[PDB]
Structures are given as C-alpha cells and as structure tokens.
Ligand binder design. Structure first.
Ligand SMILES: [Mg+2]
Ligand SMILES: [Mg+2]
Lengths: 412, 408
C-alpha cells in the first residue's frame, strides 16, 4: 500500500532537468534508478523486492521483506518470469540491468565471469514520475584523454580484421575501456551529459556499491502487447561541428558503401532474430536506414518489428535479441566468442541492457555512451563495428567520436 | 460463358498449340502461378500510339478517338467501359509511357505506349485442367559490340561522378540473325528459367516474349506491393560455384549499395501514394534465383491512400527504379541521351487486370520482333562505383537467360 501525491511545479522547461538532478542529489547514497522515456522521467528509490543473478549465473536470489530465497537457475529467463509474476511485483514498475555475460550464459558459451551481476530486477520502495513540469510521488569537469592506449586498440582491431579476412566471422564490435581518474558525481553528469545528447533513453542507477549512467542511442527491444520492435543503429560519422560539417558528414554516410553494408548486414540479422520468435510473415522493416542524431555522432538506424508467436513471450524475444547485434557482431555466437578472446577487461554492463517493465511495456535500452563505477574501477567504454574493409585508424577515431558523447560531461 | 472444362506438363505444349493453330490471330499469354492465362482475339481495346498523340478505342461497333491529355485517364475510362468492366484485361506499357506521363520530352519509337485488350476467347490453365471461355536454337554472339557499350557505361559513370544523377540502367540491344519461333522459344526458355511471371503477346504485327524477374507493381484490394531487384551475379556454374556467388553477392558492398539505394527510392515512391506509416519492407535483400542470374530482391508494401487508385500508384512506380534509375526523371533523360535504339517495350510492363488484382510484370529477359527488327535486350544498373568491364559481363549473364533458348 503506497500513498501518492501529485504536484504541479510552476517551472519553466529550462528548470526541469535541473530539478530532476537535484532530487537525485538528495537520494545521497541510497539505491536508486533513473529512466528517461519521454515524456517521463521515472525515479525509483530503495528496494522493495529484487531478483539477483550472480556474475557466473550459478546463484539466483529473490529478496523481499520476508527474507532471501534461493531459486533454481535452470533458466535465468524462468527466474525473471517468476519475479514478474510474484505478488510483490505484479502491477509495479520494475527497473532492471542485464550484463553482457547474460548472453554467453543463455547460449551455453563458456565465459570468464566479471564482477557485476548477470541480471537484476528491482521494485523500488518509493517512486517519483516527472512529466512536463508535473510530478507524481509514491511513498510508504574531468579531463580525460581518449587518445591514450589507442595503440593497443589498433592492434586489437588489426587482429579482428585479420580474423574476418580468414573467415572466422563477418562482423565484431571491438571496444576499449578508458579508466577514469576519479569517481564521478552522478547528478551533475546526468544534467550536463543529457543536455549535450539526444538519446532514445537515459538511465542512472546505484545498487550494491555499483553505479552506471548513460545516454542510450538505441533499443535492444521494446514489446507492447504482442508487438516487438528492435532498433539496430550501425554505421557512424561524427557530428562534432557546424550544421555544414555535420550535413556533409551525414551525406558521406548515407552513401558510403562500407557503412551501408555494415548497417544492412546487421538489419538482416535482426530480422532473422525476430523471425525466430514471431508469427510467420509478420517481421517487417518499418524504417529503413535513416540517419539518427546522437550527440557527438550520427548513425544509420533501422526499425524492425513483428508479432510474437503464440508460444513466445517478451523474455524469449529478449533472449534472442540480446545483446544487440550492433554491439556484438555477426554471426552473434562467433562474435561473442571473439570479444572474449580479444578484449582484456570485463564489459560488465557495457553493451548490456537497461530494462523498465510496466503494465503495458517491456522496454530494453542498449548500454552504450555510458559511465560505470564500482569499488574497483571507474570507466567509460566505446566500441566500433569491425568488418573486412575496416582500418585500425578510422576505428580508433570512431571510438573517440562516440566517447565524446559522454567524456566531456563527466563531472566531479 | 464457360464452354468446356477438360482435365500441368501438357499446358505449355497446349499453349504452343493454340499459338500455332491460331497464328495470324492476336494472342496474349500470361503466367501467374498457379495459373496460365491465354486470351485470343479482341473484343475491346485501348491503343495509345507511339508518341502519345492519339488514343484509339476499338470494339465491335467500331473505332473511337478519345481525348489523350492523360494516358492514365484513358486507361481508367477503358476499365470502366461497359464492354470491359468485369472482364480480365491483358495490357502492355512501353518505356516511353513514363516520359509522356511525366511531361519529359522524348523521341518516339515504333511501338504503342500502352495497349489494353479484352480478348474474345480465353483459356485458363489451373490445377490439372484447362477451362475455355467464349461469347533448332539460333546461336547468338552476345560479345559483339561490347566496346561501344563499355563507352556508354563509362560516360554514365562520368556523369554520375559529376553529380548529374546517382544511378542509371544502361542497356544494349542485340539484333538477331533471323526471326524466331515464339511458341517454341516460350517452351524451351520457360524450362530454363524461374521468373515471377512469363508472357507472350502477339498484336498488330508485333510480338514479345519473356521471363519477367520481378513485379513493377501488384495491387490487391487496397494493398500495393513493388519488388525491386538490383545487384546481380551469375548462377551459371556448378552448385558450389553458384552458392559461392550467392555469398559473394550478399556481401559485396557495391551490390548492396546499388540495391538499398533502389529500395529506398521504392519506399519513397510508395509513400507518395499510400497512407502515412503503412509503407514497410516485407522482405529485405534476399537472393532471388532467375535462370542464368541471381539477384538481391526486396518486397515493399503499403496501403493506398483514400484518394489514390492503382493507376496513380502505377504512374509513380513506372518504370521500375531498377530498370530506369535514381533520381528517376534524371535517369530517364540520361537513358534517352546515352542509348541509340528505342527500348520500345524493353523495361516496360506487361499487365493483367482482373476482379482481384492489378498485376504489372517488369519487361526484362525478353525477346521482341516486329516488321523491322528482331532483338533481345539487357542492361545493368550503373553507380559511381561501377566498372565498365563488369557491367558488360553482367549484361551477357542476363542475356544468357533467353539467348540460348531462341528457336528458329
Ligand atoms: Mg561504425
Ligand atoms: Mg547490377
């Protein structure tokens, strides 16, 4: 039983995000969740009920006010379904994070565990929903050098290009972590970062000593009723200039054969993924290869949709779609294998998903253009789609173009 | 009126037989799985002459001249005519229809811009039955004159790289040593192909036959579909060869780019005539087997707007982007400067209109003959990245879909 209150803040638009970050500052050190899905910002505080999957997928724990329960881990998706069905959870927004290694675990691909949970789902104790200067309450500058270690990355890209030329796989996203000098101030980074971006969703969370914040450029998946959508963005140029340099870069992208190829190969794989969980004949491209503006960078983007088959649910669709093809590679299983052989730090949540599940929707945003901090590390991370035609130098520059989406706006 | 219903392997042979038995008679043959249609004679017809200056309507009662300010409106008038309404109509649309509909100036050829015919008799071949309704291979050298075509391609590449337009189909006509036996060529060529539609028409001393690899348009009720194919490799080797060429096609950046450029234009074309938000890609860039060649193919669909009919959709979609170019009007003008023989029906459409459809097949992989010329024709979509030698070879791969099956 939660009490609710509605407040009209007589606030100008300019003050809406400043007010949201100011609330977040008041949350201090408490566990919390922030999700932007226009026209709303959803803020959760504390933990009423949580599902926790540990880093190697061997232990599932359900926690609520009756205590901890261990659940069987025969399928993480079944644990998720059990969570969502629970009396503590039905009819409440659930805030979730899914780590990169959830994929290897679901697919029976051996992997070296990182430190972060594979999956968590949380119902918060308190919530604030901001919309157009109204609020509903439910209650009971860093300098970072993105050029550094750029040499070792070019080598990783070389290896990938060489492995693609040998036929091992067709596309792989190779990424790099940039260790940061200190922990960051989440509220301020959210404020400055967000105004410098135009993401499909924004998020921030703090849970069990781990935090992340980011400006998600695309959906892994959205399900509303029986309709499932995925939004592959792939093929990039900067937009770090005048409207003229940007338009020239847009033009240079829409017609560059290499980028078009990398885009369309990814879209075809997304179609194939949806066809696995959808009614025959229902999978269509609703928007084909249009340019999407994302702060420092612009990308070719497509929207693909289908109707879920009678025997499939949103967790089946999620398991197939995860991680985004555009953040992993083609064929997906081969690219996942390659990422674990080429990359030398755990991705953790990078290239994973942030979830908001509610009455009408299962919403899953791709974790890119994000910052991560825990007891051991504080970092940003960005990657690039590598294909046969890729060259190490362009791909290093491309990772810098993407890092410029967040790195300038990291605040202490 | 059904007259006879007499109970597949014998269908082609029978069609050939009609064509032979009743030569000197106008005949229209159309394949749309699971049926073949054959029309004979002429109960009513609309004829648009080669420069689009005269529309003639003919029925039994005689001949009429109709106002020809809009060819589409003439076609609509024919379709609502009391002698036509409720009957299947067999049609053809020449390349220069587009120029005319678009108010682009053109040099007229010899063939009609548009004909629509209601036959006097019809045979329908469906599920082991025919239903009757009533009131030597010639050797062709496809290498000859390739140097002239390569200069044509080089000129288009030059114009594209100057920014004059993005894509154009440059084609070449191959004059044949003799007239061909249409019904035998139909039989022999059909067996060697897997087209989306087949046709053979004979009308007013002109004949054309072919194995259409894609639809310009199909309208069924309010749903409009178009089927751009673009991006080609041979399928003329062993299955190992052919599967390797299919994989090479799916990953060749030049082919994928020329394909997606075309698909995006087809989307834009459908958006011009469909309900906002209804236009989708039902099939994105899958390989389509077409005899000597395999192609990247997409299927694009939409719901017609309340104020648009199938003729509005046809005039936007014609000729196929994949047989003309991008932007379409600029490409049409380029074709008219670059090519030196009239396309006539090449890159045009064959139509079948009935109770449950407006179907329009793209005219490629076809042979043509009249009182003056006997020829086959094939082209290639040229973009900034094209190589004249490759495009020449591609035309020869395409021509191999019909040239080996030309029967005298
Ligand atoms: Mg890229
Ligand atoms: Mg081609």
């Amino acid at each position: 039983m939660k009490i609710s209150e509605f407040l009209h803040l007589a606030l100008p638009e300019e003050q809406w995000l400043p007010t949201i970050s100011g609330v977040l500052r008041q949350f201090a050190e408490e566990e919390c969740y922030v999700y932007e899905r226009p026209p709303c910002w959803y803020l959760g505080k504390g933990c009423q009920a949580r599902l926790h999957i540990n880093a190697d997928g061997t232990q599932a724990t359900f926690i609520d006010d009756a205590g901890e329960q261990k659940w069987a881990v025969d399928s993480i998706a079944d644990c998720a379904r059990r969570f969502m069905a629970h009396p503590q959870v039905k009819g409440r927004r659930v805030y979730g994070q899914v780590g990169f290694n959830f994929a290897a675990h679901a697919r029976g691909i051996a992997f070296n565990a990182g430190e972060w949970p594979l999956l968590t789902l949380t119902v918060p104790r308190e919530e604030l929903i901001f919309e157009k200067g109204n609020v509903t309450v439910y209650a009971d500058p860093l300098a970072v050098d993105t050029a550094l270690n750029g040499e070792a990355y070019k080598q990783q890209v070389a290896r990938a290009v060489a492995e693609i030329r040998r036929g091992e796989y067709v596309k792989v996203i190779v990424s790099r972590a940039i260790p940061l000098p200190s922990r960051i101030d989440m509220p301020a980074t959210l404020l400055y970062g967000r105004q410098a971006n135009t993401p499909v969703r924004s998020f921030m969370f703090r849970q069990e000593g781990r935090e992340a914040l980011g400006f998600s450029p695309e959906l892994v998946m959205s399900v509303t009723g029986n309709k499932v959508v995925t939004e592959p963005l792939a093929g990039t140029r900067d937009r770090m200039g005048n409207p003229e340099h940007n338009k020239a870069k847009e033009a240079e992208l829409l017609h560059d054969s290499k980028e078009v190829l990398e885009h369309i190969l990814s879209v075809k794989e997304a179609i194939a993924e949806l066809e696995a969980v959808c009614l025959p004949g229902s999978v269509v491209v609703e928007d084909l290869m249009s340019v999407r503006q994302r702060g420092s960078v612009q990308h070719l983007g497509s929207g693909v949709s289908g109707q879920l088959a009678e025997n499939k649910d949103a967790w089946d669709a999620f398991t197939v779609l995860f991680p985004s093809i555009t953040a992993s590679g083609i064929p997906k299983n081969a690219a996942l294998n390659a990422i674990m052989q080429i990359e030398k730090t755990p991705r953790e949540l990078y290239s994973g998903a942030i979830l908001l599940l509610d009455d009408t929707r299962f919403d899953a945003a791709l974790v890119l253009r994000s910052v991560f901090q825990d007891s051991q590390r504080c970092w940003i991370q960005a990657g690039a789609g590598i294909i046969a035609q890729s060259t190490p130098e362009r791909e290093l520059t491309e990772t810098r173009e993407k890092l410029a989406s967040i790195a300038p706006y990291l605040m202490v």
